[PDB]
């Protein structure tokens, strides 16, 4: 809400929302952090779960 | 009777112990067995290691290490062939990790 | 005789399977740690209970140092 | 990402399949692995890349 990010529409808005990976037993903030992407309208089959997959990986690079 | 040789043979391995008239074996078999009787503790889900296998395998992925990866799923679909696979799992799972190395496999 | 080794031969292979995502999980255990921790999870014993006892014994031998 | 949002920009605006749009997501999340570390044949460049990383943190001490 703070930066420019909010002037979006709510939906796209809404469907960028972290995720976290699953905890080891002794980590960092930096190790395990990711935004996940949900789609639930029929245009989830132009964009499916395998293409995010790719995206996060991207993203962590 | 194959139990106390066990939590013998336990504390000798990991504190590097062999003899038993150490003061700190002693201290160190007590605790064990304290430990043991004094329970807190949660019964394994094989559910739950179900999915926390699959979860790392994706931060292996995430991380763009396919080859450690395609070990861990493979290794660990090779290992639940034949209860006590989950078990020997979760302890292996929870005794430590902070494993982002590569680690290539050897000769397996 | 030969199925009483071949026996033996299919538990060194697990022990194998076993002692390989012990190293990739970065874990101090061992194959000598290891034989004594399958002979305690065959008996019945919560994972969590053993693994207590170790991060304390791994965590008392570095005051030894 | 300018000419991989570039080729997938304009291999979406001129199409008018469904299909073409699929398949044009995916050559240009793949064109993206490409240029990048992200093979599984450029593990040593990714390494020499991860010892780029060492003397980072060791010049902060």
Request: some cysteine; glycine content about 6%; charged content about 25%.
């Given at each position: 809400r703070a930066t420019n990010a909010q002037f979006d529409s709510p939906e796209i808005l809404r469907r960028l929302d972290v995720r976290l990976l699953e905890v080891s037993p002794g980590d960092t903030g930096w190790d395990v952090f990711s935004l996940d992407y949900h789609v639930d309208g029929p245009i989830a089959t132009v964009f499916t779960r395998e293409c995010m997959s790719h995206y996060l990986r991207v993203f962590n690079f | 009777a194959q139990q106390e040789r066990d939590v013998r043979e336990l504390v000798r391995g990991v504190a590097g112990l062999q003899d038993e008239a150490d003061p700190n074996f002693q201290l160190a078999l007590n605790f064990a067995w304290s430990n043991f009787r004094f329970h807190r503790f949660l019964d394994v889900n094989s559910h739950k290691i179900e999915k926390t296998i699959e979860g790392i395998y994706e931060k292996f992925v995430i991380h763009s290490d396919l080859s450690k990866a395609a070990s861990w799923k493979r290794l660990t679909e090779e290992f639940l062939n034949a209860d006590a696979h989950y078990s020997i799992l979760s302890l292996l799972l929870c005794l430590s990790d902070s494993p982002s190395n590569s680690s290539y496999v050897e000769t397996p | 005789a030969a199925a009483a080794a071949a026996n033996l031969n299919a538990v060194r292979e697990?022990?194998?399977?076993?002692?390989?995502?012990?190293?990739?999980?970065?874990?101090?255990?061992?194959?000598?740690?290891?034989?004594?921790?399958?002979?305690?999870?065959?008996?019945?014993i919560n994972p969590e209970a053993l693994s207590s006892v170790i991060k304390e014994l791994r965590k008392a031998t570095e005051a030894l140092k | 990402l300018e000419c991989s949002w570039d080729e997938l920009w304009n291999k979406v605006q001129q199409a008018q399949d469904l299909d073409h749009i699929i398949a044009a997501h995916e050559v240009f999340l793949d064109t993206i692995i490409s240029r990048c570390l992200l093979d599984s044949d450029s593990r040593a460049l990714l390494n020499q890349l991860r010892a780029v990383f060492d003397q980072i943190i060791e010049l902060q001490n």
């Open positions: - | - | 697990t022990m194998d399977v076993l002692l390989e995502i012990s190293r990739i999980l970065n874990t101090g255990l061992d194959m000598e740690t290891l034989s004594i921790c399958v002979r305690l999870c065959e008996q019945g | -």
